[PDB]
Design a protein around this ligand. Structure first.
Ligand SMILES: Nc1nc2c(ncn2[C@@H]2O[C@H](COP(=O)(O)OP(=O)(O)OP(=O)(O)O)[C@@H](O)[C@H]2O)c(=O)[nH]1
Ligand SMILES: Nc1nc2c(ncn2[C@@H]2O[C@H](COP(=O)(O)OP(=O)(O)O)[C@@H](O)[C@H]2O)c(=O)[nH]1
Ligand SMILES: Nc1nc2c(ncn2[C@@H]2O[C@H](COP(=O)(O)OP(=O)(O)O)[C@@H](O)[C@H]2O)c(=O)[nH]1
Ligand SMILES: [Mg+2]
Lengths: 426, 409, 50, 50, 410
């Protein structure tokens, strides 16, 4: 029916998506060789959203891997569920950006994104009625930020009346891998404010604290973080793949959650998330799900909403549940903590239910809250960017490649008006 | 299909003594050679070394022709006085060699123009072969004297007087110097003290690589009639630079990664030409590439593309398709005691350009200086010549210089 | 001898220097003009559809 | 000495050995990109027409 | 009943045809449908090999499927051409073509109702191009009312084998424009590019290219050999693609073509065949069709397919790319369906497009021809054999007025 193509950029995007296709294929019962082995008819009836039957029970994922280094692509086909992707979908450069956003947006982008667009165009016309596009990338890298950024801009010029998601991890001062993170973040977000339909703000700090306290893991490699992110992404699209009492497509959530067109950066959470010592001691009820859902520490972004107010919030529930519990729980969590919600919008929480849980659990949830606390992140990177730019450090790879001085001044100005308009609407 | 080989002189039959050693060591494919040869010389010393050598029984006794006394570095003596009694016996044998044959591709002649026998009776043999057959090809692989390395004194007189007939008698003429080959053995083969034997061994490699298309089945075969069209754009411009790759020792060969792309390049640098001349001064009129062994048509195709797109070397404005390729399957063989290592694939390039126009001009001054004072002329005139043919051979090379300059424009 | 060696290298260096490709730059210019023509052609057609 | 100086300045003027092929191959690839782009623009216009 | 006799000339023609008779023999073999329509290519194959160098004939008997030809059909010279069109057309032809005409007449009258003759040759070599050219002429004056096919490879400056390619190509097309009914233009540049991009081979020897050309030739004559829901013989396609009697040089593409690594990851449907069929990167000629317009187009399909899908898909590809087709002809596309696929597939397709972008190659060769002929390079090897100066002028004139009528109709 409605179809979503998948686009993974850079190293972070590629590895996030690899675990994503593994988890999804397990939900629909496709083995790593790409054949159907499920039992229920509910699994076979909605695999056209993410796959195409090739020949004789061969279901291939509708995904496009794109980056600038061969190591990532080889690491995809090596691991399991690596043999399911069509090899033509490996659009692929060779030289590399080197964490230089200009090289990802002006130097190397000019020779790859045309090739990327051919594969993307083929995957859009391969399906009938597009629901939207799904892009997983970072904001601190070069080949994920710049390459994915220019791709997003060109795509919105081609298919403008279609939805678009960008799952993006953002950098933070405590988890600081690259040195030019602020230059990449502020310019990348400057493009996201005018191109993306809605963006989902992620960051690595929150992922580390989820695996520290909630999951109580000892050695949380990147496989577990990608495992966490994949559960959230599968949750946002369960409504398209399984029937339920209250369905909510991507368009339904965006039109309902975004009160003003430029304010489309979200904070995400997921429930339930429990450690192996406490997976036995818990119950599975809607209120138990709700408090662990709205918890401050359980946000999958390191921006505490309790420093500000909620504008809108959304809940996507999965499993056999009673809709009265759904509605009364949203009403109670809004009445006790009444100051944390915006005032000139009553009933700031939209909720929906789907009748198919993730495999291995009786009942789960997914939270999408559009709060006003996100301006902290924009200031936290803006001051670092201004601190660097007022002495032109690290600028010659930017100005020597094609940027001028006015682009950084444009970035600050757009940065400053967005944090100012967040401040007004709060 | 068969082709017979004639060898004249001290240099000719020593080249043949190495060439036939390679042919027997290499071998229905044999039918084109098995020998269909004739050695002939005026001095009996080198021919009768073959008669008592290891290949006593291999050659039929009559084949090895030998005169009574040498021409002694005297073109007139070896063309007018002593040639007149032996050339008739030689060509009246070669005829019955051709009557033994049925599908004669042609003859191929080996001679050095510096001497009297290689030069004098070389031209004399060529003139009666041209009037007797006319149409059949006669490939002449000659050895011209080097500019600075030299063994004789009167060789300018011989080289000019020989060339005047090498123009309009041979069909395809390959130059080969001694300094260039000495440089090849010094540079690539790293042999610091080479002798004539090593030179003759790698000369045979070139000959074998251009007849292997007749002998063995390849992906793209090429006959002797093919060179006749694809490399000579004018009836009097047939003088070919030669090259070969990879000329490489036994240890270096294993270390390096021989492939098709780099040997197509290596066959084009002036550090690997068989004639001491710099083709950077000239413009390539046509090129011919014989590939032996492990060759697919793609990489040879890709290699000629890179050459055309380079600008270190240029072509004439006339030929966009300035190449002729050729691929054969059997790899080149090796001789015990030889210095060339076994290779999966080799390239013998035969080109045509205007760099050759420099060697004739260089030759002119040396001949001109000696002739002006009439040095050594009394030897040739008393032999039977006159001042007429000295001056007229001089003006023939003058015409050839203007010819190359005109065509090169 | 060394002077002749140096002279050849200069002539080689002068040959290698990149030279403007007239037969190709004009193609690029003509391609952009047709591209811009089609953009304006496209906007009139979209107006017609509305 | 004068020929050596001319050699060095000409050597600096060529902008490197590999420079000519890169500029040549870049403009050729540019030709291909405009051709590809022109096709997609034509398709949109003709689709609009129908 | 309806009959096609085969002629193979030159080294290029012989090796292509050897692969061609491998795939046809394998195609005609369980099913009784295979036995009813073998008279078209068999009596031993109805083929005639023809060359001048015994290595190619020995190479034919050596390989497998080499012992099935009748040795009397190995009509064959001994001296050789040497890439000399004058030798292939005036000297060596004059004593071998009489013999080929004997054997061709015997193979033609052996059957009852000829459909046509099928010639496979080149345009750069001498004994392939020139002799096969003279052969075509002798055949045209004896049998005028029969069909004729010539699969001819054309040389490109990027795949430049010999030095005298333009001198042979220009003269060869000077005879093709009057003698052959229609021709399918091929080249090695597009073939090598196809095996790189779509087939993704690392070592594409001639066996692969000849296998690709063979698949096309088998595809064009499937309608005679097998029943279909919509039959189109050779004469039917000719009248639907040729608007004017001299405009009969076609470009060919075959589908489906996928690398062995992606053979099981792909779907096989009529929309999927049409996307690859109309792809400009899938023509087997180095003539980008988007540099001009299409006069007409034809698609031959094999396999159990729904005819409605065929017609609606062709209508779509004509509506979307509406600028690339001729204006005074609506519905430029001819289609046909046969129910028997080639061995190893379920559903195949063959594209024949008569476009006006083919004038690029003819003009592309003339500048090389004019470059050589201006200052008379390599001319004596043709002149001293019997040709005169006015032949090159005539050949050049026909090249120029040919590209003009494409330019005219474009
Ligand atoms: N490559 C090569 N050249 C040789 C060889 N022997 C002699 N030459 C060349 O031959 C030239 C002189 O001619 P020779 O072959 O030695 O003697 P000739 O040609 O028989 O003439 P006569 O001395 O009168 O008998 C010299 O310039 C040498 O360069 C050889 O074994 N190999
Ligand atoms: N969740 C997750 N994040 C990653 C992984 N690898 C790298 N990152 C993040 O990516 C950022 C650096 O971006 P980088 O991988 O260089 O992006 P790219 O070069 O554009 O592909 C760091 O802040 C990391 O937190 C991974 O496997 N999982
Ligand atoms: N596709 C293909 N082309 C070939 C083959 N053999 C030769 N050619 C082409 O034929 C041309 C040379 O033909 P040639 O051998 O001179 O023909 P002939 O001398 O008249 O028999 C070259 O451009 C080659 O690309 C082959 O087996 N397959
Ligand atoms: Mg001697």
């Amino acid at each position: 029916m409605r179809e979503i193509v998948h686009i993974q950029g850079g190293q972070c995007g590629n590895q996030i998506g690899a675990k994503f296709w593994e988890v999804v294929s397990d939900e629909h019962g496709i083995d790593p060789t790409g054949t159907y082995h499920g039992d229920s008819d509910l699994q076979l009836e909605r695999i056209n959203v993410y796959f195409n039957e090739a020949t004789g029970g061969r279901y291939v994922p509708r995904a496009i891997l794109m980056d600038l280094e061969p190591g990532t692509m080889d690491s995809v086909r090596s691991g399991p569920y690596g043999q399911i992707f069509r090899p033509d979908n490996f659009v692929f450069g060779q030289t590399g950006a080197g964490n230089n956003w200009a090289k990802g947006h002006y130097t190397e982008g000019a020779e790859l994104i045309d090739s990327v667009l051919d594969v993307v165009r083929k995957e859009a016309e391969s399906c009938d009625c597009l629901q939207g596009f799904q892009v997983c990338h970072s904001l601190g890298g070069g080949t994920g930020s710049g390459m994915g950024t220019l791709l997003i801009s060109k795509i919105r010029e081609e298919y403008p009346d279609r939805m678009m998601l960008t799952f993006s991890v953002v950098p933070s001062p405590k988890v600081s891998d690259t040195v030019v993170e602020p230059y990449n973040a502020t310019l990348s977000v400057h493009q996201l404010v005018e191109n993306a339909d809605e963006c989902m703000v992620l960051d690595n700090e929150a992922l580390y604290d989820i695996c520290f306290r909630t999951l109580k893991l000892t050695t949380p490699t990147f496989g577990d973080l990608n495992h966490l992110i994949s559960a959230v992404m599968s949750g946002i699209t369960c409504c398209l793949r399984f029937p339920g009492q209250l369905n909510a497509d991507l368009r339904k959530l965006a039109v309902n959650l975004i009160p003003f067109p430029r304010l489309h950066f979200f904070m995400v959470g997921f429930t339930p998330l429990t450690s192996r010592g406490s997976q036995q001691y818990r119950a599975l009820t809607v209120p138990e799900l709700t408090q662990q859902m709205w918890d401050a520490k359980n946000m999958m972004c390191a921006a505490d909403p309790r420093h500000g107010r909620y504008l809108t919030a959304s809940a996507l529930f999965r499993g056999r549940m009673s809709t009265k519990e759904v509605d009364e729980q949203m009403l109670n969590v809004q009445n006790k903590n009444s100051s944390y919600f915006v005032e000139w919008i009553p009933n700031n929480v939209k909720s929906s239910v789907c009748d198919i849980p993730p495999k291995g659990l009786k009942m789960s949830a997914t939270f999408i809250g559009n709060s006003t606390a996100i301006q902290e992140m924009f200031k936290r990177v803006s001051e670092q960017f201004t601190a660097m730019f007022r002495r032109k450090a690290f600028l010659h790879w930017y100005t020597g490649e094609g940027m001028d001085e006015m682009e950084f001044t444009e970035a600050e100005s757009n940065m400053n008006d967005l944090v100012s308009e967040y401040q007004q609407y709060q | 299909r068969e082709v017979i080989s004639i060898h004249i002189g001290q240099a000719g039959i020593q080249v043949g003594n190495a060439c036939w050693e390679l042919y027997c060591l290499e071998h229905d494919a044999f039918n084109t050679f098995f020998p269909r040869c004739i050695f002939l010389d005026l001095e009996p010393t080198v021919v009768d070394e073959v008669r008592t050598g290891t290949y006593r029984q291999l050659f039929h006794p009559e084949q090895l022709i030998s005169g009574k006394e040498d021409a002694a570095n005297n073109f007139a003596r070896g063309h007018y006085t002593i040639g007149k009694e032996i050339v008739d016996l030689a060509l009246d044998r070669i005829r019955k060699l051709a009557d033994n044959c049925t599908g004669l591709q042609g003859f191929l002649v080996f001679n050095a123009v510096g001497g009297g026998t290689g030069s004098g009776l070389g031209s004399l043999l060529l003139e009666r072969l041209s009037v007797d057959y006319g149409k059949k090809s006669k490939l002449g692989f000659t050895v011209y004297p080097s500019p600075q390395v030299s063994t004789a004194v009167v060789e300018p007189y011989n080289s000019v007087l020989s060339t005047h007939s090498l123009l309009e008698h041979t069909d395809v003429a390959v130059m080969l110097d001694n300094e260039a080959i000495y440089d090849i053995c010094r540079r690539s083969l790293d042999i610091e003290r080479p002798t004539y034997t090593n030179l003759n061994r790698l000369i045979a490699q070139v000959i074998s690589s251009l007849t292997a298309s007749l002998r063995f089945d390849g992906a793209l075969n090429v006959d002797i009639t093919e060179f006749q069209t694809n490399l000579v754009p004018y009836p009097r411009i047939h003088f070919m630079l030669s090259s070969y790759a990879p000329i490489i020792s036994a240890e270096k060969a294993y270390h390096e990664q021989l492939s098709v792309a780099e040997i197509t390049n290596a066959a084009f640098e002036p550090a690997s030409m068989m004639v001491k001349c710099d083709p950077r001064h000239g413009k390539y009129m046509a090129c011919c590439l014989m590939y032996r062994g492990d060759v697919v048509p793609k990489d040879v195709n890709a290699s000629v593309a890179t050459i055309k797109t380079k600008r270190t070397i240029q072509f004439v404005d006339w030929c966009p398709t300035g190449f002729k390729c050729g691929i054969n399957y059997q790899p080149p063989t090796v001789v015990p005691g030889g210095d060339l290592a076994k290779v999966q694939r080799a390239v013998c390039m035969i080109s045509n350009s205007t760099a050759i126009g420099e060697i004739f001009s260089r030759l002119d001054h040396k001949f001109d200086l000696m002739y002006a004072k009439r040095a050594f002329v009394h030897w040739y005139v008393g032999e039977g010549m006159e001042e007429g043919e000295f001056s007229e051979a001089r003006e023939d090379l003058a015409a050839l210089e203007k010819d190359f300059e005109e065509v090169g424009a | 001898n060394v002077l002749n060696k140096q002279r050849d290298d200069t002539t080689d260096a002068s040959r290698l220097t990149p030279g403007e490709l007239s037969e190709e730059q004009a193609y690029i210019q003509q391609l952009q003009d047709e591209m811009k023509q089609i953009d304006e052609e496209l906007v009139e057609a979209e107006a017609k559809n509305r | 000495s004068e020929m050596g100086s001319t050699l060095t300045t000409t050597r600096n003027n060529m902008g490197g050995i590999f420079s000519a092929k890169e500029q040549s191959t870049a403009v050729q690839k540019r030709i291909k990109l405009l051709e590809n782009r022109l096709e997609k623009a034509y398709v949109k216009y003709n689709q609009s027409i129908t």
